[PDB]
Design an enzyme around this catalytic site. Structure first.
Site, PDB file in Angstrom:
ATOM      1  N   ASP A 181      37.319  35.909  44.232  1.00 25.98           N
ATOM      2  CA  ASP A 181      37.834  36.726  43.568  1.00 25.98           C
ATOM      3  C   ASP A 181      37.253  37.953  43.607  1.00 25.98           C
ATOM      4  O   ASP A 181      38.031  39.151  43.242  1.00 25.98           O
ATOM      5  CB  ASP A 181      38.512  36.055  42.283  1.00 25.98           C
ATOM      6  N   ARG A 208      61.427  39.107  43.667  1.00 25.31           N
ATOM      7  CA  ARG A 208      61.918  39.210  42.127  1.00 25.31           C
ATOM      8  C   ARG A 208      62.877  40.829  41.927  1.00 25.31           C
ATOM      9  O   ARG A 208      63.250  40.663  40.892  1.00 25.31           O
ATOM     10  CB  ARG A 208      61.162  38.675  41.457  1.00 25.31           C
TER      11      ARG A 208
END
Lengths: 402, 402
Positions: free
Chosen positions: A166, A101
């Protein structure tokens, strides 16, 4: 930004971009320990953690909230301006999505060459086209790392819970970022860190996998929480609840065997005098030991077992249920569970700061902030005018306080 | 000491006292990333990790080995002399065991006032008389923290594996020590860190426990690795193996329901149009969804499921067995599993350095050292003569190379 001075990390400026657990857990740990941590949220949709009814009050405390589209136009300009005075930037996304991006590490270092950048992803910043751009999921990371197949029961694998991958991955990012920060202070040059969740969990599951890699065999899964290899080690059911134990040591084994009806096995060629451990598959009496141990434990209360195991110095502990924690003497004495005020003035209960720093302890100074709560102050601080901010808001590139 | 200059922690001097996993994992992580790390072992007996046939080649790589009785006479003198140039000292012990043996933080700071001291224990450096002085065990930390009770199957709790609590606790110590290290740069004052294993694990188990603490309910245990709350999320069995999946999204649910034989439920009051997530307990058809999903997946191979789920954009992954990792394209591309030479000149296979630092990558420079291998060099470096060292060996206060 306004906040009390405290902890080993007072004055450190951390920013994170990400949602849910892995990335934000990494960033917010800095905040538990005194750092100035800015939580970036998208403008159109807030962090999805916020749909959780209670957890976010814990997992987002001590944070400042910025709502900014960091990839687009003036929003990107503002983000990169913020980087100029940021020490550590943490982001969790789908592989090298930042570079894709337009925000490469090169671009980041154009704005701050000292910046520590931590990239948290499922499969890494580089690799094959198949895996590299895939999303990060805790269950997928356990699946892909060999962690899931080794957890659970003999004939039923299960992931570690909750969201174990996580937390390991976020913690690693924190650790690695603090290591890179040391290098910055020694060296005046920044760093980029590629934390792939499956590589984190690969490491964490090596205790027996190293046997497989090196001419041995992988261990079996536990049977009902019992050690894969050693009898009398792991989870057991008492009359009264569950216990964990470690049947280890010459005297421990001798006296336990006598208790459970197996005194006649002592001094056998299979269990010779001086035996320190019972290998359940190598020892022919392995299964028999488990039978008699189960039977003896099933007869006794946890209080009874604990009393006997204390005499024998067999390490053990009751498996505590959630309702038993708050009133436990150690928890009380250590204030391991405490209370604080949410930003809207409600009392919230949860774990205290961990770990405990002696000279510079952490503290809870702020409840979880609302969506874009600190945007106006942050943008002002980095040189944006009132009009600049209004324009950002009206264009949908920033969100200010509710 | 002789070693290549590399990693973000080049030049940092770390020393650890402890055995097995928790403490040594904390210390050795510094060595993965370039630090000079000294592993202390007792004189008459070595670290018990060494009885493991393969793992220690990984868990003790890149280390220097010192064999010294740090609590007795001239051995205590040598240890405290070593502290004078040490940046971080990590110790794992039964609560405040060091203090009780005369080596208090105050004594340590008398030799190095900048010293970062990490104390890893099961129950903390302080608390009650019943718990504080207990030994650290992975299963006990899980049991005591409420981690164990939330892992496993509906009616069968199980600990996370392998030694999950030791790794979390060890990693936390590395993280906290690095944070304290940062503060020393400003103040010139050291720090003492009280890492209690149960408090580490308490934090890691909060996702749902925060509901219990704040007026809600604790979650149930997973059923066969399936999400406690949301249907179609978690572990599932296919014809030729296991997968993990996340049934999330409007079209994903619509098209999956059709595949599995539940088209007639779409648009009902129970599953309205635009449903994105199936709450298995709140939806009267939750169990039915599981039945049909189990049935459909049982019919299909993993290849077939992945093909279909790719079409539908349902995130999923095969649960890989240990033999499937080495040849996986992502593992290959990222060199996630590598090889190095043991100090006995054998080839050893295991995980590469993680995570991947871009500018200053870690490296494997040394196999696991033998018991007391670097004792002589370390003591010479801190001012001891050949005769000083020989006297320590004869008094049983130190062991040199095999």
């Amino acid at each position: 930004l306004p906040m009390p001075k405290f902890g080993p990390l007072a004055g450190l400026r951390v920013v994170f971009s990400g949602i849910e657990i892995a990335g934000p857990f990494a960033g917010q740990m800095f905040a538990e320990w005194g750092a100035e941590v800015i939580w970036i949220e998208n403008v159109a949709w807030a962090d999805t953690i916020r749909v959780q009814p209670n957890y976010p009050q814990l997992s987002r405390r001590n944070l400042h909230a910025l709502s900014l589209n960091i990839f687009k136009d003036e929003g990107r300009e503002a983000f990169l301006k913020l980087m100029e005075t940021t020490d550590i930037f943490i982001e969790a996304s789908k592989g090298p999505a930042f570079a894709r991006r337009g925000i490469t590490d090169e671009v980041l270092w154009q704005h701050n060459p000292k910046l520590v950048i931590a990239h948290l992803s499922g499969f890494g910043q580089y690799g094959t086209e198949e895996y590299t751009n895939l999303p990060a999921y805790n269950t997928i990371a356990q699946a892909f790392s060999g962690y899931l197949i080794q957890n659970g029961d003999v004939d039923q694998p299960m992931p570690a819970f909750p969201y174990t991958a996580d937390y390991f991955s976020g913690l690693t990012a924190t650790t690695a970022a603090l290591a890179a920060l040391h290098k910055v202070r020694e060296t005046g040059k920044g760093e980029s860190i590629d934390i792939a969740m499956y590589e984190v969990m690969l490491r964490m599951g090596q205790y027996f996998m190293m046997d497989y890699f090196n001419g041995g065999e992988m261990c079996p899964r536990m049977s009902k929480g019992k050690d894969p290899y050693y009898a009398g080690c792991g989870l057991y059911k008492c009359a009264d609840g569950y216990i964990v134990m470690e049947l280890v040591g010459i005297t421990q084994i001798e006296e336990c065997f006598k208790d459970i009806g197996l005194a006649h096995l002592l001094g056998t060629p299979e269990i010779p005098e001086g035996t320190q451990l019972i290998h359940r598959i190598e020892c022919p009496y392995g299964p028999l030991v488990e039978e008699k141990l189960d039977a003896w434990l099933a007869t006794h209360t946890i209080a009874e077992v604990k009393e006997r195991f204390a005499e024998l110095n067999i390490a053990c502990a009751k498996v505590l249920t959630v309702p038993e924690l708050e009133s436990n003497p150690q928890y009380v004495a250590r204030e391991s569970i405490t209370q604080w005020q949410t930003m809207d003035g409600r009392t919230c209960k949860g774990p205290n700061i961990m770990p405990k720093f002696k000279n510079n302890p952490g503290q809870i100074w702020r409840g979880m902030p609302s969506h874009g709560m600190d945007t106006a102050a942050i943008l002002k601080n980095i040189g944006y005018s009132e009009n600049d901010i209004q324009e950002l808001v009206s264009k949908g590139l920033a969100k200010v306080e509710d």
